[PDB]
Ligand binder design. Structure first.
Ligand SMILES: O=S(=O)(O)O[C@H]1[C@@H](O)[C@@H](CO)O[C@@H](O[C@H]2[C@H](O)[C@@H](O)[C@H](O)O[C@@H]2CO)[C@@H]1O
Length: 138
């Protein structure tokens, strides 16, 4: 469902992941949470074009890709962490031509350049772990 979807969330992306297409994830980080992930995925159990992994322990926002069975290099740099314990967040993820463009609460969070080149192949949004979702628009 679009409203209060229970985690783990599986929502399929109509026509594949198109360019110009924005996904909205509004949610809540529990105080007793350590890790959650947002996965843009080729098939229900395949390649992860974009893996996004807020980790509360060290307060990192880990971006990576899982391609051909292996994790590439992590990108960690941010100017802010909206996923602090007990915080609500409003994420806007836009699939661009050369990058994903990611905003949290209206503030730019990260860009992640496509490594899975043909980003169209992505057909599965996957959210898992320590997060409470209030609204998910694909
Ligand atoms: O969903 S999982 O693939 O099972 O979880 C892993 C992912 O979040 C990837 C993304 O890069 O990280 C894996 O672990 C890392 C960890 O970030 C790093 O600190 C450590 O030194 O290397 C790992 C790989 O062995 C997660 O397990």
């Amino acid at each position: 469902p679009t409203f209060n979807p229970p985690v783990p969330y599986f929502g399929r992306l109509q026509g594949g992941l198109t360019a110009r297409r924005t996904i909205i994830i509004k949610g809540y980080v529990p105080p007793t949470g350590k890790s959650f992930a947002i996965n843009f995925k080729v098939g229900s159990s395949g390649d992860i074009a974009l893996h996004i992994n807020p980790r509360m322990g060290n307060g990192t926002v880990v971006r990576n890709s899982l391609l051909n069975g292996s994790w590439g290099s992590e990108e960690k740099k941010i100017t802010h962490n909206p996923f602090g314990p007990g915080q609500f967040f409003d994420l806007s993820i836009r699939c661009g031509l050369d990058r994903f463009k990611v905003y949290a609460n209206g503030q730019h969070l990260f860009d992640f350049a496509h490594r899975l080149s043909a980003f169209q192949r992505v057909d599965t949004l996957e959210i898992q772990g320590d997060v409470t979702l209030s609204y998910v628009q694909i």
